[PDB]
Amino acid sequence: SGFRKMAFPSGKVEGCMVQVTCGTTTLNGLWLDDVVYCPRHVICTSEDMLNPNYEDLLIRKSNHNFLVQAGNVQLRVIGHSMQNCVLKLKVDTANPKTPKYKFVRIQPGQTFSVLACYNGSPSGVYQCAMRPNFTIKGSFLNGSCGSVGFNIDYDCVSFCYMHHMELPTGVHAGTDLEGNFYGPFVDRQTAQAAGTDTTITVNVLAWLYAAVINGDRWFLNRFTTTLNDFNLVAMKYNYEPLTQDHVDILGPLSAQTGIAVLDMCASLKELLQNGMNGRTILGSALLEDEFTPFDVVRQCSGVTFQ
Amino acid sequence: SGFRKMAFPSGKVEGCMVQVTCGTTTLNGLWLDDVVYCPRHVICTSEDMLNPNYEDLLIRKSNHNFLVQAGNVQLRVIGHSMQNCVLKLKVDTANPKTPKYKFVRIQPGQTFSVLACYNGSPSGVYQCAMRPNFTIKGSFLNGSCGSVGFNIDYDCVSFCYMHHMELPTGVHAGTDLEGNFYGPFVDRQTAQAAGTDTTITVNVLAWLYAAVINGDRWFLNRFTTTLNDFNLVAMKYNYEPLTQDHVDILGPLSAQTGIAVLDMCASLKELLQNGMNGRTILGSALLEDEFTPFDVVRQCS
Numbered sequence: 001s002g003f004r005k006m007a008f009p010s011g012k013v014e015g016c017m018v019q020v021t022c023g024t025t026t027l028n029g030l031w032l033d034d035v036v037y038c039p040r041h042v043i044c045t046s047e048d049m050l051n052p053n054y055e056d057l058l059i060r061k062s063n064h065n066f067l068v069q070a071g072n073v074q075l076r077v078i079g080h081s082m083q084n085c086v087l088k089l090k091v092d093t094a095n096p097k098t099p100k101y102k103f104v105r106i107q108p109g110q111t112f113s114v115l116a117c118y119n120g121s122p123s124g125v126y127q128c129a130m131r132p133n134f135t136i137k138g139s140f141l142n143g144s145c146g147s148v149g150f151n152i153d154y155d156c157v158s159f160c161y162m163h164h165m166e167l168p169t170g171v172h173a174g175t176d177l178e179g180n181f182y183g184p185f186v187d188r189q190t191a192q193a194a195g196t197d198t199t200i201t202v203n204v205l206a207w208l209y210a211a212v213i214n215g216d217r218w219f220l221n222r223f224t225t226t227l228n229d230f231n232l233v234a235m236k237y238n239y240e241p242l243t244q245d246h247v248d249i250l251g252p253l254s255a256q257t258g259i260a261v262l263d264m265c266a267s268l269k270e271l272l273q274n275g276m277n278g279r280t281i282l283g284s285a286l287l288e289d290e291f292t293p294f295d296v297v298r299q300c301s302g303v304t305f306q
Numbered sequence: 307s308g309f310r311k312m313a314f315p316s317g318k319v320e321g322c323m324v325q326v327t328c329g330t331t332t333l334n335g336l337w338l339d340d341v342v343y344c345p346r347h348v349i350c351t352s353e354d355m356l357n358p359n360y361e362d363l364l365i366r367k368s369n370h371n372f373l374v375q376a377g378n379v380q381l382r383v384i385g386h387s388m389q390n391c392v393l394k395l396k397v398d399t400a401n402p403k404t405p406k407y408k409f410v411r412i413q414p415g416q417t418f419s420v421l422a423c424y425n426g427s428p429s430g431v432y433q434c435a436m437r438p439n440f441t442i443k444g445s446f447l448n449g450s451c452g453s454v455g456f457n458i459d460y461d462c463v464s465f466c467y468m469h470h471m472e473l474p475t476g477v478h479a480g481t482d483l484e485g486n487f488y489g490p491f492v493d494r495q496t497a498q499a500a501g502t503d504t505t506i507t508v509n510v511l512a513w514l515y516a517a518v519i520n521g522d523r524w525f526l527n528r529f530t531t532t533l534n535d536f537n538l539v540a541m542k543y544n545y546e547p548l549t550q551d552h553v554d555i556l557g558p559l560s561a562q563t564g565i566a567v568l569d570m571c572a573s574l575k576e577l578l579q580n581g582m583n584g585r586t587i588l589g590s591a592l593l594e595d596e597f598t599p600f601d602v603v604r605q606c607s
């Protein structure tokens with residue numbers, strides 16, 4: 001029993017974190033095999049943050065202009081290349097701690113663990129979801145660039161995020177491990193803003209299924225809804241549209257609890273109109289949207305507390 | 307910017323988890339130097355635990371009754387003993403991944419990272435606080451016993467918790483790594499109720515400071531209070547007493563924001579008496595009490 005924001009054990013990622021220095025700029029790098037991945041703006045100085053031409057800044061660098069440190073050991077850079085907004089530094093030593101890994105680009109609503117790092121040293125681990133507006137609500141300070149997000153389903157590390165910037169709203173933006181940004185953001189200091197954010201409807205429903213699995217049913221009602229009527233109502237509260245794909249994904253949780261998906265949608269509609277009336281759901285007084293259906297199945301018992 | 311519930315990186319502890327089996331009972335163990343630490347009830351069969359006589363059940367067992375597995379390798383048990391509610395198993399191989407560590411017993415209100423494990427394998431990590439009623443609001447299923455709680459400080463892992471049980475309310479209970487229970491609990495198959503829980507006042511104040519540092523100021527006011535007046539309202543709302551030591555600990559956060567501890571206490575006194583009026587603080591409609599003043603400083607710096 002219980003339900004918490006649960007991150008993956010971070011050991012497999014900790015053994016990949018390095019420090020990358022170019023000039024007076026220092027950030028984190030990810031050392032996998034003989035390659036170090038880091039944000040390409042490690043090659044930027046104060047005067048080229050608004051409109052840097054990364055191709056022109058990089059051609060002026062040699063391999064020995066990059067200082068890579070793994071703990072107290074200096075790694076020698078023997079090659080380099082830029083791929084989108086990521087710099088790939090080839091080093092003379094393959095990381096002996098390289099885990100089984102893959103690079104995946106995630107969709108909005110998906111969650112992952114973030115290992116926040118400063119100067120190549122891990123500081124903490126927390127969970128976060130890719131918001132519908134392609135930002136994440138993280139906890140990142142100066143020098144956190146190059147920190148990565150990942151999942152570790154079945155002993156394979158899936159890297160899905162690399163940290164690059166903080167927007168004026170206090171939310172965060174970054175790229176996948178191929179250097180392609182999530183959303184319309186750019187690695188420039190130009191005026192950028194996150195679009196209006198929405199609630200991840202399929203995740204709220206998954207978390208309501210988690211509450212039922214853990215023994216709470218106070219919020220259910222005698223009603224049902226069509227998918228059309230549910231979307232007409234939920235969008236008036238700034239909820240993301242629920243698709244037939246989301247209904248299908250919720251199938252296993254619906255089967256375990258005996259609560260039809262559209263019946264849980266009717267519960268959600270009533271929760272939006274009434275509030276909780278002094279009650280909590282899984283310890284929360286608001287509707288939580290950063291647990292996916294897969295996260296619920298991972299953490300919850302396969303037996304409902306009937 | 308941003309404020310999240312954060313756990314310590316768990317790599318140093320992951321390299322210490324093993325599986326321990328005695329008969330048909332399998333649970334997790336912690337392998338440090340040449341010893342494996344696990345809950346003593348690994349020697350109980352599902353019948354023996356209604357009222358176990360651990361002294362007698364241990365006397366019946368020998369080294370051959372224990373099976374320790376580190377990944378795919380089997381460790382040979384060459385000694386055994388009980389210390390309080392933990393079983394200590396001496397093995398023939400010292401763990402080469404043993405970090406610099408110490409066993410520490412935490413106080414209520416203090417926080418720690420839990421590495422939830424099943425069959426000796428780390429499954430997840432989350433942060434939790436030792437409640438004033440000595441329970442933790444964890445997330446544990448069948449097979450989680452032996453999972454440990456810890457804090458990290460300059461390469462040194464301070465182990466503070468070992469998981470043993472779930473109470474009827476769904477909250478969890480355990481021991482320090484010397485086998486001493488936190489709270490009035492016993493390792494027996496009986497429904498045990500924890501005392502009425504109370505809110506950790508100093509942590510709520512720390513989190514209100516974290517909110518101010520992140521731009522949330524609506525709850526700030528012109529008023530100030532004293533300890534004795536604040537403690538009278540704390541008592542009424544089932545909040546733990548605020549002491550001068552707590553005021554001293556909050557001192558750095560107090561100077562950094564320009565809000566004295568007793569000025570922030572007047573904001574908390576107002577939130578308890580009047581509510582939040584539809585507003586949220588740091589994305590929460592509740593007053594969060596599982597962030598210590600150190601968690602706030604560590605994260606914000």
Ligand SMILES: *[C@@](O)(c1nc2ccccc2s1)[C@H](C[C@@H]1CCNC1=O)NC(=O)[C@@H]1[C@@H]2[C@H](CN1C(=O)c1cc3c(OC)cccc3[nH]1)C2(C)C
Binds near residue numbers: 186
């Ligand atoms: C990162 O760790 C980097 N720091 C530097 C320093 C020099 C060169 C390159 C880099 S990458 C930070 C992480 C940030 C800092 C606070 N919290 C974070 O998440 N990333 C940045 O500083 C990025 C890089 C330029 C600008 N930037 C911003 O986050 C940024 C600038 C900015 C302005 O500028 C006027 C106004 C408002 C908000 C804002 N954010 C890059 C995008 C290349």
Ligand SMILES: *[C@@](O)(c1nc2ccccc2s1)[C@H](C[C@@H]1CCNC1=O)NC(=O)[C@@H]1[C@@H]2[C@H](CN1C(=O)c1cc3c(OC)cccc3[nH]1)C2(C)C
Binds near residue numbers: 333347348449495498
């Ligand atoms: C743990 O992993 C153990 N499992 C076994 C199995 C055989 C022998 C020893 C152990 S330790 C679990 C973890 C629990 C289970 C669900 N989530 C958890 O956190 N611990 C237990 O099962 C403990 C051990 C006996 C009973 N117990 C309970 O949690 C327990 C019993 C109980 C009753 O009994 C009537 C009523 C209500 C609640 C309740 N919880 C020990 C305390 C020794």
